[PDB]
Amino acid sequence: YTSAGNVTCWYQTGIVVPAGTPTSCSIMCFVSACNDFSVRLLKDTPFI
Amino acid sequence: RVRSITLGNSTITTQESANVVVAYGRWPEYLKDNEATAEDQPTQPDVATCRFYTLESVTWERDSPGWWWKFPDALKDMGLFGQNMYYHYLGRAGYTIHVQCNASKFHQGCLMVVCVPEAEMGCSQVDGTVNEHSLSEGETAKKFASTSTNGTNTVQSIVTNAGMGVGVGNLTIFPHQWINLRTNNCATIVMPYINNVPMDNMFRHHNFTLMIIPFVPLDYSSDSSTYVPITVTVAPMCAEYNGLR
Amino acid sequence: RVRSITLGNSTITTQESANVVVAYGRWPEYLKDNEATAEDQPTQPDVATCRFYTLESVTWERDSPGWWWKFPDALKDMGLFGQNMYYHYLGRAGYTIHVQCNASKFHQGCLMVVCVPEAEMGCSQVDGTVNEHSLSEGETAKKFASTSTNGTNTVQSIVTNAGMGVGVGNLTIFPHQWINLRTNNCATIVMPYINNVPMDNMFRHHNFTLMIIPFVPLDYSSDSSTYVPITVTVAPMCAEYNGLR
Amino acid sequence: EGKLDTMEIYRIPVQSGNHQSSQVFGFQVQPGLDNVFKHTLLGEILNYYAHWSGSIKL
Amino acid sequence: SESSIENFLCRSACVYMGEYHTTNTDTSKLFASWTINARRMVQMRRKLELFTYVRFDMEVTFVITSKQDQGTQLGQDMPPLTHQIMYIPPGGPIPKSVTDYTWQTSTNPSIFWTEGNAPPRMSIPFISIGNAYSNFYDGWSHGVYGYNTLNHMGQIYVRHVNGSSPLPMTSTVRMYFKPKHVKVWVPRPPRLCQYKNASTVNFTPTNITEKRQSINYIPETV
Amino acid sequence: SESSIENFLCRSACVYMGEYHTTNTDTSKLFASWTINARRMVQMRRKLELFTYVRFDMEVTFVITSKQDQGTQLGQDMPPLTHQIMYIPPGGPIPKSVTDYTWQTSTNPSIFWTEGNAPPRMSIPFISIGNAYSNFYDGWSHGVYGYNTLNHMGQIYVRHVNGSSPLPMTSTVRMYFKPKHVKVWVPRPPRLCQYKNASTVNFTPTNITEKRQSINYIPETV
């Protein structure tokens, strides 16, 4: 109900550690725009 | 020191320090033009056959004998490359296979990754015949066993004879790569099309077989993860079919 | 004075004395390269989209009001061109349409064959809305009526208003061809891709509509055949999709 | 739920043990409209304009 | 020369007339609004339907007249009245009261005007992420048949610019619309039936033309 | 092109609306006043906070409307009314009555205008002994946190220009403000919380964004 692309991530193997290291961990995502970005029709923002 | 590779609308990431085996020295290519000039005209898709297809990961535990896949028909449900298998009567293709592991410096183990042409397999009963389901299950892997198997119509899959009646320490004669958790975790194999005819039908013949076999089992200690994931990614190269017009 | 044409693994036969209408003077072609250079890369199948697809014939009898088809989705079950409609999110194409009759010199009648872009149709109830099934049935033709229709969600298909609210004698403003059983029995129309954007999704939009409408009804006498068959053949041209890699 | 006001909102959890075919995360790529992209630096700009288009880097 | 596209389409017309008050007990009668399309003016609609795709700029002029309500109170001495005319692009905030915050958003262009002067006027460019507008769409919105979202052109809203507790007044606005720098594609046959509503092509079946006496009849020559 | 700094900031807006009488028994209702800053307009404030330093000129237009009070007396015949609009630079005298001497000082620029004509307009340059204005100040005034005296921009005062013993009238002024020739330095993140008052950055803690169902949830595709 979007008509947009999507991204997903899957466990291929699983995480393997030696003795004496933390068990769980984390991933972080960063987003940005590439040089070819364009905008039109200045309007008012819906946040204030 | 990381490279990012895009094929079509797919993107994966590898390390630029990769090592690549080109199977017998031969890169894939089109059968050039004039083996069968007059009424044998081929066509090529080059649309969404050249793209990365990623299977489900497998789970490497302490007692894992190994895994195998058959090519093609591991890709008979994979989007367009699978559609072309039903629409066309003859075809051919080469492949690029990436195999990756996710492990830490506190794990240890060793894998052989080998691509075997014409891997004809034996039955568990000496005066028997193998079934079609026991040879492959498509995009799901079959499993080797650690002892000798029984039951009707099953491949005899004891891992020391690799289902072919040879010694498994001698499979290095084929295009192969080693994965030692100590020094690397990835392997790329580029396979060309190998047959005794130029084209063929892709449903009743298995061109080659991909096998993954642990030679030193996975070991870990106190509170590391108890498994390691392995991931396989395939990109078809220079695919070509019979013309329809 | 007969030509034989082969597209792919298809072959049909026409007469070299054919007449061809190129819709607005424009042949089909690829959107060249650089409308959307950076992250809009297309691909083209050119495999078994360029090939003749032949629908079922229709039967022209004494009281036949007419027939219409929607493009695309008259080809959503047609082999590879239909597979590509499901695998890809955007596409575009031009077409070549051949229409043929099989009749004798003892028959008589006259047909208009017209290709209409954006043929938006009206409902049988003025404060109603049209259904998706009543607009098309795929490779089966819808039928015009000779009187005004009723029922919910149906196109108002009286043939004099052509379902669009205009006078049917004025449809010659569109790319069209006449078939007069006295002088010819065939018609070729080459249609380019016409939209107000360069690509589009092929499932919820009907680019154009092919209509076939008798202006003088079929007549025969004593023991001639009581019907005449009409046959439609379509070849897609310069098809192009969004890249998947 | 339960962590819209902590630093934990930014961390994708990777768990321990053997789960080698399960999903880790997934989202639709819709800057400007979708909640996960809406308040970023790119999302905040796009919400000043009624039409926009380009490529995105993750 | 008079049949060129510009001379045929580029002509001004009144497309909306609305009324609004300074004080009321309905609060929707305190402002006037219009959605821009060319389907509720029957004479412009028909000339536009001869083509499938169109591209133009818009020019809008406003004629505004006021009146003191016949309620009761006389002897007033009032300065001239001020009005605000706001254009909202596609993808903009819509006001719901006359006291709303959206009457102050920096990206909604706005005109302030006081009576007695020349009539106000603004010029809008071709605003579409597509390459042309379409008069006909044989598709689904994503679901409404025949409606595509590339044809959005914006909205206009008008209010009074008083302070607190104003005096009662009633105003009328008339909007005059004109397309400019026009280009058209794919001609069509002319509409033969009467229009039934503003969003569909629905129609009741109509005769092809009117009758005469016989297929030979020609009227006597003078 | 529409994301350039000039097209993003250089836009007109109503920032102050005030009322004033000709006769009253309060004597502060006889004139209207406004201090120039850009912190009590919430939509302009947020767009300006994306930068740390700004430099611009100001343009101000005035829309003025009058009314006779509903008190009692009718049958009047009045000439059009005159108004005086005075700008005070930073470091100028401030009036306290409408009869004060400061309404005549030669260094306070002033505009005289009579109703019926075009709306009046004045243009103010960049007025600061510093090199830019600052939207954020992490300091003390010499003691108020966050307030530095280089941001003074002046004041505006409006009165009627009658003679002695005038007739009762009520006027409303609306001020439209526009920055021009703008330059900005050091971009900042956008304000995530609502504003609480006009002089501080005070706020109540806010959520980072809104929730969804799970970390895997993607909505079903149409």
CSV table of C-alpha atoms in Angstrom, one decimal, chain B residues 10-238:
chain,number,residue,atom,x,y,z
B,10,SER,CA,21.1,-5.9,-7.0
B,11,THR,CA,24.0,-4.7,-4.8
B,12,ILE,CA,26.4,-6.7,-2.6
B,13,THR,CA,29.6,-5.8,-0.9
B,14,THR,CA,32.9,-7.7,-0.9
B,15,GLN,CA,36.5,-7.1,0.0
B,16,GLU,CA,38.9,-5.9,-2.7
B,17,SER,CA,41.5,-8.4,-1.4
B,18,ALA,CA,39.4,-11.3,-2.8
B,19,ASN,CA,40.9,-14.3,-4.6
B,20,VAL,CA,39.1,-15.6,-7.7
B,21,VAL,CA,39.4,-19.0,-9.4
B,22,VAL,CA,38.6,-19.1,-13.1
B,23,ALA,CA,37.7,-22.8,-13.5
B,24,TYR,CA,40.0,-24.1,-16.2
B,25,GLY,CA,41.5,-20.8,-17.3
B,26,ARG,CA,38.4,-20.1,-19.4
B,27,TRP,CA,36.1,-17.2,-18.9
B,28,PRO,CA,32.4,-17.6,-20.0
B,29,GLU,CA,31.4,-16.5,-23.4
B,30,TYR,CA,28.8,-16.9,-26.2
B,31,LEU,CA,29.1,-19.6,-28.7
B,32,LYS,CA,30.4,-17.3,-31.3
B,33,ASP,CA,28.2,-17.3,-34.4
B,34,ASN,CA,28.5,-20.1,-36.9
B,35,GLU,CA,28.4,-23.6,-35.4
B,36,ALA,CA,24.9,-24.0,-36.8
B,37,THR,CA,24.4,-20.9,-39.1
B,38,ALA,CA,21.2,-21.4,-41.0
B,39,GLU,CA,18.3,-22.5,-38.9
B,40,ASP,CA,19.8,-22.4,-35.5
B,41,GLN,CA,19.6,-18.8,-34.4
B,42,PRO,CA,20.0,-18.1,-30.7
B,43,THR,CA,18.9,-15.2,-28.5
B,44,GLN,CA,20.2,-13.8,-25.2
B,45,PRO,CA,18.1,-12.3,-22.3
B,46,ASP,CA,20.6,-10.0,-20.7
B,47,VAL,CA,17.8,-8.4,-18.8
B,48,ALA,CA,17.5,-9.9,-15.3
B,49,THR,CA,19.5,-12.9,-15.7
B,50,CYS,CA,22.6,-10.8,-15.0
B,51,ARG,CA,21.9,-10.0,-11.4
B,52,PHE,CA,22.8,-11.5,-8.0
B,53,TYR,CA,20.4,-14.2,-6.6
B,54,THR,CA,20.9,-15.0,-3.0
B,55,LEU,CA,19.7,-18.3,-1.5
B,56,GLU,CA,18.9,-19.0,2.2
B,57,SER,CA,21.9,-19.3,4.5
B,58,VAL,CA,22.9,-22.6,6.0
B,59,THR,CA,23.9,-23.2,9.6
B,60,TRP,CA,27.3,-24.7,10.3
B,61,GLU,CA,27.3,-26.4,13.7
B,62,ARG,CA,29.7,-28.8,15.5
B,63,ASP,CA,28.5,-31.9,13.7
B,64,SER,CA,27.7,-30.8,10.1
B,65,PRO,CA,28.7,-33.3,7.4
B,66,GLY,CA,28.1,-30.9,4.4
B,67,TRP,CA,25.8,-29.6,1.8
B,68,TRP,CA,25.3,-29.8,-2.0
B,69,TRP,CA,23.3,-28.0,-4.7
B,70,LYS,CA,22.6,-28.9,-8.4
B,71,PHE,CA,22.9,-26.4,-11.2
B,72,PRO,CA,20.7,-25.5,-12.8
B,73,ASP,CA,17.3,-26.0,-11.1
B,74,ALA,CA,18.6,-24.5,-7.9
B,75,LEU,CA,17.4,-21.4,-9.8
B,76,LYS,CA,14.2,-22.7,-11.3
B,77,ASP,CA,12.1,-20.4,-9.1
B,78,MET,CA,14.5,-17.4,-9.3
B,79,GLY,CA,12.6,-14.7,-11.1
B,80,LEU,CA,13.4,-14.3,-14.8
B,81,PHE,CA,16.2,-16.8,-15.2
B,82,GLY,CA,13.6,-19.4,-14.0
B,83,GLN,CA,10.9,-18.1,-16.4
B,84,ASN,CA,13.4,-18.6,-19.3
B,85,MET,CA,13.8,-22.2,-18.3
B,86,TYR,CA,10.2,-22.9,-19.1
B,87,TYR,CA,9.8,-20.7,-22.2
B,88,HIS,CA,12.8,-22.0,-24.1
B,89,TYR,CA,13.7,-25.4,-25.3
B,90,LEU,CA,17.5,-25.1,-25.2
B,91,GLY,CA,19.9,-22.9,-23.3
B,92,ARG,CA,23.4,-22.5,-21.8
B,93,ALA,CA,25.2,-20.2,-19.3
B,94,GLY,CA,28.2,-19.7,-17.1
B,95,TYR,CA,28.1,-18.6,-13.5
B,96,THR,CA,29.9,-16.6,-10.7
B,97,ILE,CA,29.5,-18.1,-7.2
B,98,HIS,CA,30.3,-16.2,-4.1
B,99,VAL,CA,30.4,-18.1,-0.7
B,100,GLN,CA,30.8,-16.2,2.5
B,101,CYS,CA,31.0,-16.9,6.2
B,102,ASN,CA,30.2,-14.9,9.3
B,103,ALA,CA,32.5,-15.8,12.2
B,104,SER,CA,34.7,-14.3,14.9
B,105,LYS,CA,38.4,-14.6,15.8
B,106,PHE,CA,37.4,-16.9,18.7
B,107,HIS,CA,35.9,-19.5,16.3
B,108,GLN,CA,37.9,-22.1,14.2
B,109,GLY,CA,37.3,-24.5,11.3
B,110,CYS,CA,38.0,-25.3,7.7
B,111,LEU,CA,35.8,-25.7,4.6
B,112,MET,CA,36.3,-27.0,1.1
B,113,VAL,CA,34.2,-25.4,-1.6
B,114,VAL,CA,34.2,-27.3,-4.9
B,115,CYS,CA,32.3,-27.2,-8.2
B,116,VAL,CA,32.1,-30.7,-9.8
B,117,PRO,CA,30.9,-31.3,-13.5
B,118,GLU,CA,28.7,-34.3,-14.1
B,119,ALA,CA,28.4,-35.4,-10.5
B,120,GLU,CA,26.6,-38.7,-11.0
B,121,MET,CA,25.7,-40.2,-7.7
B,122,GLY,CA,25.2,-43.8,-6.4
B,123,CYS,CA,22.2,-45.5,-4.8
B,124,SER,CA,22.1,-46.6,-1.2
B,125,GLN,CA,21.1,-50.0,-2.5
B,126,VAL,CA,23.6,-51.5,-4.8
B,127,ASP,CA,20.9,-53.1,-7.1
B,128,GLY,CA,18.7,-50.0,-6.9
B,129,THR,CA,18.1,-46.7,-8.7
B,130,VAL,CA,18.1,-43.2,-7.4
B,131,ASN,CA,15.0,-41.0,-7.2
B,132,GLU,CA,14.6,-37.6,-8.6
B,133,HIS,CA,13.8,-36.0,-5.3
B,134,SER,CA,16.8,-37.5,-3.6
B,135,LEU,CA,19.2,-35.8,-6.0
B,136,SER,CA,18.0,-32.3,-5.4
B,137,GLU,CA,15.4,-30.1,-3.8
B,138,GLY,CA,15.9,-26.9,-5.7
B,139,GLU,CA,17.1,-24.0,-3.7
B,140,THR,CA,17.2,-26.1,-0.5
B,141,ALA,CA,20.4,-28.0,0.1
B,142,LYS,CA,20.7,-31.7,0.4
B,143,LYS,CA,22.8,-33.0,3.3
B,144,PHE,CA,25.7,-35.4,3.5
B,145,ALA,CA,25.7,-38.0,6.3
B,146,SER,CA,28.5,-39.0,8.7
B,147,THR,CA,27.6,-42.8,8.4
B,148,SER,CA,26.3,-44.9,5.6
B,149,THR,CA,22.7,-44.5,4.7
B,150,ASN,CA,19.8,-46.8,3.9
B,151,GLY,CA,16.3,-46.7,2.6
B,152,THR,CA,15.1,-47.0,-1.0
B,153,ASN,CA,16.0,-44.7,-3.9
B,154,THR,CA,18.3,-42.5,-1.7
B,155,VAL,CA,21.8,-41.4,-2.7
B,156,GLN,CA,24.4,-43.2,-0.6
B,157,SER,CA,25.6,-40.0,1.1
B,158,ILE,CA,28.4,-41.0,3.5
B,159,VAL,CA,30.6,-38.0,3.3
B,160,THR,CA,33.9,-39.8,2.9
B,161,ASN,CA,32.9,-41.1,-0.5
B,162,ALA,CA,31.1,-37.9,-1.5
B,163,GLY,CA,28.3,-40.0,-3.1
B,164,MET,CA,30.5,-40.7,-6.2
B,165,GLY,CA,32.7,-43.6,-5.0
B,166,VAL,CA,36.0,-41.7,-4.7
B,167,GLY,CA,38.1,-40.6,-1.8
B,168,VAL,CA,37.0,-37.2,-0.6
B,169,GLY,CA,40.6,-36.0,-0.1
B,170,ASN,CA,41.0,-36.1,-3.9
B,171,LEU,CA,38.3,-33.7,-4.9
B,172,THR,CA,41.0,-31.0,-5.3
B,173,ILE,CA,41.3,-32.1,-8.9
B,174,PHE,CA,38.2,-30.0,-9.6
B,175,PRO,CA,37.8,-26.2,-9.3
B,176,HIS,CA,37.9,-25.6,-5.6
B,177,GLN,CA,38.7,-23.1,-2.8
B,178,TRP,CA,39.6,-23.4,0.8
B,179,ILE,CA,38.1,-21.3,3.6
B,180,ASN,CA,40.2,-21.3,6.8
B,181,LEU,CA,38.4,-19.3,9.5
B,182,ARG,CA,41.9,-18.1,10.7
B,183,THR,CA,42.9,-16.4,7.4
B,184,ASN,CA,39.8,-15.7,5.2
B,185,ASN,CA,36.1,-16.2,5.1
B,186,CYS,CA,35.1,-15.9,1.4
B,187,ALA,CA,35.5,-17.7,-1.9
B,188,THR,CA,34.6,-16.8,-5.5
B,189,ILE,CA,34.5,-19.4,-8.3
B,190,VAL,CA,33.8,-18.4,-11.9
B,191,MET,CA,32.4,-21.4,-13.9
B,192,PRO,CA,32.1,-21.6,-17.7
B,193,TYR,CA,29.6,-23.7,-19.6
B,194,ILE,CA,31.0,-27.2,-20.0
B,195,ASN,CA,29.2,-29.9,-22.1
B,196,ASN,CA,29.9,-32.2,-25.0
B,197,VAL,CA,27.2,-30.3,-27.1
B,198,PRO,CA,26.9,-26.6,-27.6
B,199,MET,CA,23.4,-26.2,-26.1
B,200,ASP,CA,21.1,-28.5,-24.1
B,201,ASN,CA,17.8,-28.7,-22.3
B,202,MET,CA,17.9,-27.4,-18.7
B,203,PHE,CA,15.4,-29.6,-17.0
B,204,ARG,CA,16.6,-33.2,-17.3
B,205,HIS,CA,20.3,-32.6,-17.0
B,206,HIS,CA,22.4,-31.3,-14.2
B,207,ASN,CA,25.5,-29.5,-15.6
B,208,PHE,CA,27.4,-29.2,-12.4
B,209,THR,CA,27.2,-29.6,-8.6
B,210,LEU,CA,28.3,-27.2,-5.9
B,211,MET,CA,29.6,-28.9,-2.7
B,212,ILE,CA,30.6,-27.5,0.7
B,213,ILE,CA,32.4,-29.8,3.1
B,214,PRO,CA,34.0,-29.2,6.5
B,215,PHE,CA,37.3,-30.9,6.9
B,216,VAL,CA,38.0,-29.5,10.4
B,217,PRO,CA,34.8,-29.1,12.4
B,218,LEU,CA,33.6,-25.9,14.0
B,219,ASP,CA,34.9,-25.3,17.5
B,220,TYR,CA,34.1,-22.6,20.0
B,221,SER,CA,34.1,-22.1,23.8
B,222,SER,CA,32.3,-20.7,26.7
B,223,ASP,CA,29.7,-18.2,25.5
B,224,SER,CA,30.4,-17.7,21.8
B,225,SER,CA,27.6,-18.3,19.3
B,226,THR,CA,27.0,-22.0,18.8
B,227,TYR,CA,26.7,-21.8,15.0
B,228,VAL,CA,28.2,-20.0,12.0
B,229,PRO,CA,26.2,-18.9,8.9
B,230,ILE,CA,27.2,-19.5,5.4
B,231,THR,CA,25.7,-17.6,2.4
B,232,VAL,CA,25.8,-18.4,-1.3
B,233,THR,CA,25.2,-15.8,-4.1
B,234,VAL,CA,25.0,-16.6,-7.8
B,235,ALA,CA,25.1,-14.4,-10.9
B,236,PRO,CA,24.4,-16.0,-14.3
B,237,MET,CA,26.8,-15.0,-17.2
B,238,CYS,CA,26.3,-15.0,-21.0
